[PDB]
């Protein structure tokens, strides 16, 4: 009974936050964005088709120069790409062909690769050796590496299927700080631009904030009704948006801690697998389990643009930091970029 | 259109040629999925064909075999089951003498794993092979503990036929598919002969589907 008396005091604490959640929220963002002129139509044509893989393409990440990108496919090969000239620059064999994530370092020196093999692999691109060699293997997880992201050249934060997120360091290869609190396996994580706070999404119908330095949970965001497949952060750093299997894309603020709106359409029953923003907002790219991608207005939740290039389910998506193009990969073994 | 651009085109052609050769070399290998449960004789099957997933490779005659053992994953199956869509065959290992054990008997919950994996939307047409284990101990010890509804013979062969019949008809998704059961003696010399004759029986019919005949 001693655990049971701790339950209802935690439930009223959950009632203590949620009425304070409702005390802050009286008017939504949708009534605020009535006066703003709608974006209209966004016609985007495939400038370059970065194909050359042989199996299902699962993850991509843009480089900081917005020319090179890294693409991970389930054949067992990792390819660094070039945007304008459409010529691959590096082809990286993988020790484990099972890969579900990839990361490009902000410095451009390193590339992180993972998968369900419980190993994180980091590869040095511009070696004095001249070849591409793995710096070292990273083995401290017991699930499946859902997503790994480069916080820094020396600090890398990954999200794994053992219901935990862990901060690593290359020079020692051990967990400096580990993040626990997600009941189910996490699926994606998107760090803020200042690389101090980051968020993770799981199969909990909820997402939780994290502070990198001391490794404690800051915020607990819920409102979903199924597993979050992909998450993305607002480049302002003051908001973020999520995608799930519920075919609803929801927008959240960090300190205002509320669901601003849900991006749902009746014809869209297929869930979301990739979310990315624009630099100024006013846009939300979203990839669905249906074979076309989709573009949403970030402020009015309208059917702004439609991207129907691929014939298979889109798995990965991303945008350049200068905004020049958006990238999109799918299980059809093709990469194509619009503008 | 300079020397640097020409040499970039050169290196792109080089990497494309290497990638095409690597893909043609990789395409010959046969992919097999093992879904052996706890104490299902995974050690027995890996000893008879000879922290994450364990990958093993063996050669039979002129054909390569590439099997990936999914063991101790401890995660939600739906997130990573679609990674094995291109795998030709799914191998199932089930112990038979563990019908006297309850965690909710292992036998009954084993059918729920098979019922779920058969009725999924990714595995509409993937040939299913299931094996057995501990059948001699099951014959020695045996009925009323796990299957009182049979209400029949305690004899081993009729009981083994009863258990094998229940797994063959978990659901009607096996109608479009093809189940390949085999009485695994756990001492039989090459039970990969069951697999090799089954995996070629997929390959003729996979060719026949692609041949535009049947």
């Amino acid at each position: 009974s001693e655990l049971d008396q701790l339950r209802q005091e935690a439930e009223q604490l959950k009632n203590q936050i949620r009425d304070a959640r409702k005390a802050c929220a009286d008017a939504t963002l949708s009534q605020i964005t009535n006066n703003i002129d709608p974006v209209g139509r966004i016609q985007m044509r495939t400038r370059r088709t970065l194909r050359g893989h042989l199996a299902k393409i699962y993850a991509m990440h843009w480089g900081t120069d917005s020319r090179l990108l890294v693409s991970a496919s389930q054949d067992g090969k990792l390819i660094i790409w070039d945007s304008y000239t459409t010529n691959k620059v590096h082809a990286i064999p993988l020790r484990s062909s099972w890969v579900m994530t990839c990361a490009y370092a902000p410095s451009g020196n390193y590339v992180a690769c993972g998968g369900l093999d419980n190993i994180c692999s980091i590869y040095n691109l511009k070696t004095r050796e001249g070849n591409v060699r793995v710096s070292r293997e990273l083995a401290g997880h017991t699930g499946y590496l859902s997503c790994c992201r480069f916080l820094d050249d020396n600090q890398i934060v990954t999200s794994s299927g053992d219901t935990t997120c862990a901060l690593w360091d290359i020079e020692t290869g051990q967990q400096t700080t580990t993040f626990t609190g997600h009941t189910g396996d996490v699926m994606s994580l998107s760090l803020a631009p200042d690389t101090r706070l980051f968020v993770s999404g799981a199969c909990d119908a909820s997402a939780k904030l994290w502070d990198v330095r001391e490794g404690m949970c800051r915020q607990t965001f819920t409102g979903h009704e199924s597993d979050i497949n992909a998450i993305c952060f607002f480049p302002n750093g003051n908001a973020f948006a999520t995608g799930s299997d519920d075919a609803t894309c929801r927008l959240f603020d960090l300190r205002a801690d509320q669901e601003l709106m849900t991006y749902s359409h009746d014809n869209i029953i297929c869930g979301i697998t990739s979310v990315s923003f624009s630099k100024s907002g006013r846009l939300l790219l979203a990839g669905y389990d249906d074979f076309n991608c989709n573009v949403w207005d970030a402020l009015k939740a309208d059917r702004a643009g439609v991207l129907a290039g691929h014939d298979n389910r889109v798995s990965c998506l991303g945008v350049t930091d200068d905004g020049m193009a958006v990238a999109t990969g799918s299980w059809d073994s093709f990469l194509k970029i619009w503008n | 259109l300079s020397a640097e651009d020409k040499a970039a085109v050169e290196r792109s052609k080089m990497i494309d040629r290497n990638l095409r050769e690597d893909g043609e070399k990789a395409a010959r290998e046969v992919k097999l999925l093992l879904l052996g449960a706890g104490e299902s004789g995974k050690s027995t099957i890996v000893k008879q064909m000879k922290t994450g997933i364990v990958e093993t490779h063996f050669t039979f005659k002129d054909l390569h075999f590439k099997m990936f053992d999914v063991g101790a994953q401890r995660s939600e199956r739906k997130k990573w089951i679609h990674c094995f869509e291109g795998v030709t065959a799914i191998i199932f290992c089930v112990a038979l003498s563990d019908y006297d054990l309850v965690l909710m008997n292992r036998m009954h919950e084993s059918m729920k794993l098979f019922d779920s994996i058969c009725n999924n939307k990714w595995f509409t047409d993937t040939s299913i092979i299931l094996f057995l284990n501990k059948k001699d101990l099951f014959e020695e010890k045996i009925l009323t503990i796990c299957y009182p509804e049979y209400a029949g013979s305690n004899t081993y062969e009729e009981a083994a036929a009863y258990i094998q019949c229940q797994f063959e008809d978990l659901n009607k998704r096996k109608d479009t598919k093809e189940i390949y059961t085999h009485f695994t003696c756990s001492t039989d010399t090459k039970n990969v002969q069951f697999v090799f004759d089954a995996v070629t029986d997929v390959i003729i019919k996979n060719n026949l589907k692609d041949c535009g005949l049947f």
Partner: single-chain antibody
Amino acid sequence: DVQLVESGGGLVQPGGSRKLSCSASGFAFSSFGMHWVRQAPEKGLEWVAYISSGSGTIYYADTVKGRFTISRDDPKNTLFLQMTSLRSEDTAMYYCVRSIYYYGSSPFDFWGQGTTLTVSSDIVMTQATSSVPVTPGESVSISCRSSKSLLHSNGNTYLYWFLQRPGQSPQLLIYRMSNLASGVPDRFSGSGSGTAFTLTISRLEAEDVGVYYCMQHLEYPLTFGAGTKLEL
């Protein structure tokens, strides 16, 4: 780390033939492109030959074409060059050069030791004065002009600066007119216009003494400069 050692550089009868080989070790030479660069025994650095990464594209010079050939063999990891019909112009200190070619790659990054080989249009690029007297601690600037502008349509100019250390192999300082090479201090920095090109040496000390060079990279001829011997 890596080793580029050359073999068989000696006396050859005029008009004869000599096999020249560059033994490579410690890098992915199957992926690396290879060059050959002539150094005259007194003065004058210039290009000899180019071989592809996959041995598909081969280029030569005006006095090099036909009577020179260059080959390679990846499994034993060495570079080859069969050389015919030698004379006084062929008398040279031939250097072994590696060069990798992709986006952000630094070609001509490492050089071999050389061959002591003695016997018995094109883009003009001139360095202004071959001798600049300096003091160890003040900043100097040198430059070389180009016949034509090196600014290609993709917005990237192609020019490389080199330092001939006195008596041994050179090195690459800055590649494509703006990006310094690895292992080089940040004091060296090149700049200039689309046709005017210059180097800015800042706070030089007692190891920068030597002959400096600049190269064109718009075409596979890869024409050199005259050379500025930077004496103290």
